[PDB]
């Protein structure tokens, strides 16, 4: 009979288990025998207190490096303001030691945990690339609770070295199965930010994770967008509980918050899943998340049923992760077919946007060719356009099976006149749909101002396969 942790703060880890059913169903995975044994997770952040009493037992120097100071030791820089506590807090969510009388437990409390010290300094493209590409045949899962500024006016993503690190990771990492990159979707909710304007979250190579409050609501800091894949619990208002983890200076905190806490919990759940089937590819893992995540009792006003009967929201993706369901489904999972890419250049001429622009195109999705796709994974609308005030634009993409993805909602703070330069807006909401047929792109001016611009390029990029579909939900 599985015995649950005895750690002093484990009873406060409401998000891991409970009779209330408002949890991530992690105890069910532990009871099936999966606690993270043999899996390696690295926290890319501001350092990791490797000697912390709740991390030392799981700490892995092979999963760690200090890119800011160019040395092996990711120990945080200590200051009066405790600025560099962030990475240690994320690490304990993944892999705090269990049954040792200290603080609480990680989701994967027997996994190995490392940290890359890379935020405590100038975060160049090279710094990011050396972190994302660290020891890719030893580290299985990378967790990143950072990204571009959440001011609600920035459009930014990986530069060349970092994007090369993503491609090298998913292609050759983990023995060719592909590095697993877990990303926090952002804290720009108050600024009405969009996580599709963040190229790290919007990347197909990352599992972008949003947050839900204890009572099942969209937290104040949450960013909505179509690239988000799933959700884990984090903080909310001051009547709602928060996240329990290891803190700087060998302390325990019950008040870790925001998007930062959701990605590490997802990374832990993914670690348990990898223990259940070490042969899962980077794409397999995204399929498992899509199929097992749970919308129930997450409140949002935009829940929609997609073409294969799955509920999806821009606040939550496919819903809350379900660790027990993940590890169960992983065990007899059949590896997905190799990824196909179908490129469709939509426009025959530039189109003035004006107050509203609708572009309709019927596609065959590379019919008759080796990259024919009947089972979509990610889809991108790669858009090049000029506009006088970028944040007044709202952009939607409708799939042939009727699923309306918001690629871009209005951003009141985005005054930019720089437009979008082949920006690859991504949606997860049409996963497993047949992409053959009519796609519709809608661009509209959400303001009363007489704005102006031109759409000069729209590439529809379809990823996926031509086999293995399930009966729709």
């Amino acid at each position: 009979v599985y015995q649950e942790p005895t750690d002093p703060k484990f009873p406060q880890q409401w998000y891991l288990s409970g009779v209330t059913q408002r949890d991530l169903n992690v105890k069910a995975a532990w009871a099936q025998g999966y606690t993270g044994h043999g899996i390696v997770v690295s926290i890319l952040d501001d350092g990791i207190e490797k000697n912390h009493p709740d991390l030392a037992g799981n700490y892995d120097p092979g999963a760690s490096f200090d890119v800011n100071d160019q040395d092996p030791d990711p120990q945080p820089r200590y200051t009066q303001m405790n600025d560099n506590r962030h990475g240690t807090r994320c690490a304990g969510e993944v892999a705090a030691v269990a049954n040792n009388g200290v603080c609480g437990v990680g989701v994967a409390y027997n996994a190995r945990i490392g940290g890359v010290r890379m935020l405590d300094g100038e975060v160049t493209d090279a710094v990011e690339a050396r972190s994302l590409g660290l020891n890719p045949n030893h580290i299985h899962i990378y967790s990143a609770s950072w990204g571009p500024e959440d001011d609600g006016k920035t459009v930014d993503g990986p530069a060349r070295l970092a994007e090369e690190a993503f491609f090298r990771g998913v292609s050759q990492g983990r023995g060719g199965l592909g590095s697993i990159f877990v990303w926090a979707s952002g804290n720009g909710g108050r600024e009405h930010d969009s996580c599709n304007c963040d190229g790290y979250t919007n990347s197909i190579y990352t599992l972008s994770i949003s947050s839900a409050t204890q009572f099942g609501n969209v937290p104040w800091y949450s960013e909505a967008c179509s690239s988000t894949l799933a959700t884990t619990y984090s903080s909310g208002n001051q009547n709602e509980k928060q996240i329990v983890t290891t803190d700087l200076r060998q302390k325990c905190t019950e008040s870790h918050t925001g998007t930062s806490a959701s990605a590490p919990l997802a990374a832990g759940i993914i670690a348990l899943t990898l223990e259940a089937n070490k042969n899962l590819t980077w794409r397999d893992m995204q399929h498992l998340v899509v199929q097992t995540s749970k919308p129930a009792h997450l409140n949002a006003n935009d829940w929609a049923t997609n073409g294969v009967g799955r509920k999806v929201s821009h606040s939550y993706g496919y819903g809350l992760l379900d660790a027990g369901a993940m590890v169960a489904l992983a065990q007899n999972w059949t590896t997905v077919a190799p990824q196909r890419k179908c490129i469709i250049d939509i426009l025959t001429e530039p189109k003035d946007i004006g107050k509203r622009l609708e572009v309709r195109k019927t596609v065959t999705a590379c019919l008759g060719e080796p990259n024919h796709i009947t089972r979509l994974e990610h889809a991108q609308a790669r858009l090049t356009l000029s506009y006088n005030r970028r944040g007044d634009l709202a952009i939607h993409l409708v799939s042939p099976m009727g699923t309306r993805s918001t690629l871009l909602a209005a951003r009141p703070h985005d005054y930019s006149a720089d437009g979008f330069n082949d920006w690859a807006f991504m949606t997860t909401h049409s996963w497993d749909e047949d992409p053959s047929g009519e796609w519709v792109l809608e661009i509209e001016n959400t303001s009363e101002a007489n704005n102006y611009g031109t759409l000069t390029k729209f590439t529809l990029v379809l990823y996926g396969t031509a086999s293995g579909s399930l009966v729709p939900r």
Partner: peptide, 4 residues
Amino acid sequence: XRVX
């Protein structure tokens, strides 16, 4: 940028 890059923010925690």
